[PDB]
Each structure stands twice: as C-alpha cells, then as structure tokens.
C-alpha cells in the first residue's frame, strides 16, 4: 500500500500518518511527501522518518498547468494507491482531481459542508457556533467537493480564545485521518458515484455515524 | 506495495531490496523482516532501515505446524503483496507455500533446476562446472519448486578457491532479485498454471532470456 502525502506547513497530520504506518495501524507506507512550501516543517518530519521529499514551488513554474503536470508526473512515479492531502494549501485543478479519482483523500478543518474556505476556526467563533470539528472526505470534481467519510465533533466554549477550537480540532484530526486511511488500506473504503462506501455500505452525507 | 522478507543470516540480499525500495527502483516498501535465527545480521540491517523485525525460533515452538501458524499469522498482519525469501534456510510446509500462492518469491544459489539443495557452490566446484549462477523463482507446491523468473550466469575458473563462485554469484543476486521484485511491483510479473508470466508473455523453463 503506497501512500503519497501532500503538505504545505507544520505537518502534524503527516506525522500522525507516519506514526500509524510505523506501528502498522495503517498497513502501508508513506512513499513520498510533497510540499508546495520550501520551509514546511513537515519536510523535516518526513526526512527524519526516512521518507523521500519533493518540493514544487509555484514561482518556479511558467504556468499553473506546468506545475500540475510536474506534480502529477512526480507523484505517479511512486505508484500511489492513495494520495492524501494533509494541509496542502494549493487549489487543485479539475484535471488533477480527476486523475486521482477515488484515490484522493483530504482533511478539512470544518464540518463539511461548512466553512469550505480558510480560517474555518475563525468563522466558527464569529458565528458563535456551539460545536465545530473536522472532516475527512474523498476529493472529486462534483458540485460538492466529494463524499465525506468521517467527521469529528468538537465543542466550543464562550471565551474561546481561538485555540482549543484550533488545537481541540487538531487533536481529533490526528485520530480520524489515520483511521480513515487504515480503512482504505484494508480495502474497506471505496468511492463510487460520488459517494463513500464503507464495507459495502453507502455512507450518509456526514460520513460514518 | 507491501513487501515482507524472510531471512536466516547476513541479509546482503535483503539490503539490496531495502536499497532498491529506498531509491524507488522498486515502487514499494519492505514492511517487515522475519528471521528464524536470533543472530542474523539482517535483523540489524532492517532495524537500521527502520523496518520492523520478527524472530521466530523453532526451539520456541511445540511443533512444526505451530511455528508455521505463528509465521503465517504474523506475516499476514502486514497485508503483504509479496513474500520474498532471501536466504531463509527453513523448509517451508506445503500449507505455507499454498497460502502465499503466486506471492512467494525465492532466490536459489544455483541454475534451477540444478543443485536444489545446500552447498550449491560446493557442488559446482566438485563437478568441475564451467558456469554456475543463481535463480529467482516463484515458490509453488508442484513437482518442480515453481517457475523460474530470472537466472544470472557466472563463469567458474579452475583454481576456483570457493570464492568468487560464492562472491561472484552473490554479486549477480543483488542485481536480479530487486529487478524481479520491481517487475512484480509494477504488475508486469504474474504466476499462472505453475508458470511465470512477464508482460503477458509466458516465460520458458529458464526464466526470461
């Protein structure tokens, strides 16, 4: 089971995946880590875990398509069974998404469908939300960003600084992501007709409940 | 692509496989190394490569079947796509071989079918052979030990000490094994009707020529 992870920053989620593979919780290996930021701490985490790293900087390419072509080419060299986005802050092209059909996973710091943008934790506070969270889903080129696989709930308290909305959700992310990937690794999770299927069971819009 | 390697001694061949995966020559990873000898140097090579190791000692089991049951159980925990024997000096049971049907590879220090026993390099000298070698093959429970995939030729010189019959063949082993495994990793090598198939082409008794 070949796993290729895409990051842009710290890589705490990448670490959770690396740790899960190391303990065999996930019956596979992270073959390579791709970063679109030259100073991502995740590049160190990967290097320390003995994982090959590739850094593709936008400013280093002539066009958007040229970047995606290099990204697809280099990723495909690892024959990945699954491509997981773990904090990758680059908008993927429809062509890229299509190329990795039901092999592309992503974790969003929000209760999809909700705050499908940035500063999700910020909007959760403004709106005065009583509960926030994160969502793992399949990435597809449909009206909706693809079927949700698993969501983790987190309660918001009043004087919520910003953090432990931010760090409370991150704690949930480190648990649900490696679990969803282990499911995929075991062959229990599939993507059909823009819908997530766990053990032959179609999952609801909110993922597994 | 999950690879599980079985060894008994030095592990130079294991190293060749580890190195090939590290450079992505083989698009997969060695998930675990199993040894039936507590002092195998390969256990260190694995540990140094960050690979989990398991040591199953015969003297530690009640019967032969008990050993194989533990071996099968522990190996299966890694969901291997291929199980490769690299210097594993234990006679495998027909049940074990059957369990890993066309997923079991082995390297033999001889031109199969030839010297299918031990001290192959020794018999090559006695007989006064003009050429020796090694063979990678699929392991099956048929009259023949299974179809040969690739063989490497080595010339024997007269005052051949024993070595560079022994070290000349080993040099060939470190090259052909990772190549055959990369073929398997790429999905180009299959086993059907006790015969090796490379790129949909049935291979002859001597393997790919």
UniProtKB/Swiss-Prot annotation, chains A, B:
Pfam families membership: Formyl_trans_N
GO MF, any single term: phosphoribosylglycinamide formyltransferase activity
Gene Ontology terms: biological process: 'de novo' IMP biosynthetic process; DNA damage response
Catalytic residues (positions): 108
Effect of residue 108 to A/G/M/N/Q/R: Loss of activity
Regulation: Inhibited by N10-(bromoacetyl)-5,8-dideazafolate.
SUPFAM superfamilies from the UniProt entry: Formyltransferase
A GO cellular-component term linked to this record: cytoplasm
Keywords, comma-separated and alphabetical: Purine biosynthesis, Transferase
Record's function text: Catalyzes the transfer of a formyl group from 10-formyltetrahydrofolate to 5-phospho-ribosyl-glycinamide (GAR), producing 5-phospho-ribosyl-N-formylglycinamide (FGAR) and tetrahydrofolate.
Protein name per its UniProtKB record: Phosphoribosylglycinamide formyltransferase
């Amino acid at each position: 089971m070949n796993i290729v992870v895409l990051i842009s920053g710290n890589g705490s989620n990448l670490q959770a995946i690396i740790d899960a593979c190391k303990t065999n919780k996930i019956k596979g290996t992270v073959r390579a880590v791709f970063s679109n930021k030259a100073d991502a701490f995740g590049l160190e985490r990967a290097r320390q875990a003995g994982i090959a790293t590739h850094t593709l900087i936008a400013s280093a390419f002539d066009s958007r398509e040229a970047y995606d072509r290099a990204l697809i080419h280099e990723i495909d060299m690892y024959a990945p069974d699954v491509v997981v986005l773990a904090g990758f802050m680059r908008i993927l092209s429809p062509a890229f998404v299509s190329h990795y059909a039901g092999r592309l996973l992503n974790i969003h710091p929000s209760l999809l469908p909700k705050y499908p943008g940035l500063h999700t934790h910020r909007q959760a506070l403004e709106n005065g939300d009583e509960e926030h969270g994160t969502s793992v889903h399949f990435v597809t080129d449909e009206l909706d960003g693809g079927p949700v696989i698993l969501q983790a709930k987190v309660p918001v308290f009043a004087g919520d600084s910003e953090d432990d909305i931010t760090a409370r959700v991150q704690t949930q992310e480190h648990a649900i992501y490696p679990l969803v990937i282990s499911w995929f690794a075991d062959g229990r999770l599939k993507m059909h007709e823009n819908a997530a299927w766990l053990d032959g069971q179609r999952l609801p819009p909110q993922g597994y409940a």
